[PDB]
């Protein structure tokens, strides 16, 4: 942290919007669903890239990477900004990556989710791992900078406050839904004061799985949607009834953006709980979300991070890539 940390970074040059030729339709929350300016329901079906910091190191942070994503039918790209990578590149250096990613998405007709990709208990400052480490100050500062910088770019529609809240059964300490609600409310006040049209994606606990505590005491802000990460082994059979109880019912009251789903075989690279399945979860979760009108983002247009959507940098789809591509090609554009 010279002039690269959130608390000491210099003036940051504004984003030059003369790189953009495209203004996608403005999305807003209307009760239960996302709608455009005509009140037509929008459903988003897309992919997470890996952290731009990793893409740039791997030499695949280029237009071709984003053209392939678009060619899969993708109408939304999720950008998981790891606070670790934000510190490694510094504020200025990281915003150059994020500007370029957003430019490529925008020109290809794809909406963006900016995801502050942490994991654990922000209030108590206990994270799954050092790569997720952040603070309330750094988190608020990030949302202050990106909400202002991308204000008026309709394609940058969604602001995902904090990827995966969890206390890991007390290993990461204690936080009530009430305390988490207050932190989300402050983050959304920051976002809306810089960016009147920003939609905010709010998560509950058990790694952004549960929405029952959210439903009982919802975020008192406009333009809010609720996140779940219903990975294959978060619950067992019967799947649809369990999903409905835990998060799906929330789609009746607010839009639900399942910002991570994915799956691979127990034999596939980096296979771990809760991402292991025989392949039946793919159609099951996709069909469930079609019945419910739920937006979703498959985890990870990357050949290294698990579960993989692509087998290598030749961009051949994996089992999960094949399935999500088929659904995005049929049901999106």
Residue numbers in the entry: 6 to 338
Relevant lines from the article:
Cellvibrio japonicus is a saprotrophic bacterium which possesses the remarkable ability to grow in isolation using a variety of hemicellulosic polysaccharides as sole carbon sources. It produces a diverse collection of GHs, assembling enzyme systems that can degrade cellulose, xylans, mannans, and xyloglucans, among others. Effective xyloglucan-degrading GH systems (recently reviewed by Attia and Brumer) contain exo-acting glycosidases acting as debranching accessory enzymes and endo-acting enzymes (xyloglucanases) that generate short, branched β-(1,4)-glucan oligomers (xyloglucan oligosaccharides).18−23Exo-acting enzymes are expected to address each of the glycosidic linkages reported in xyloglucan branches, though the reported enzyme diversity falls short of reported branch diversity. The work presented here comprises the design and validation of trisaccharidic xyloglucan (“XyG”)-type cyclophellitol probes and their validation as bona fide, predictive tools for the identification of xyloglucanase activities and their discrimination from cellulase activities within a xyloglucan-elicited C. japonicus degradome.
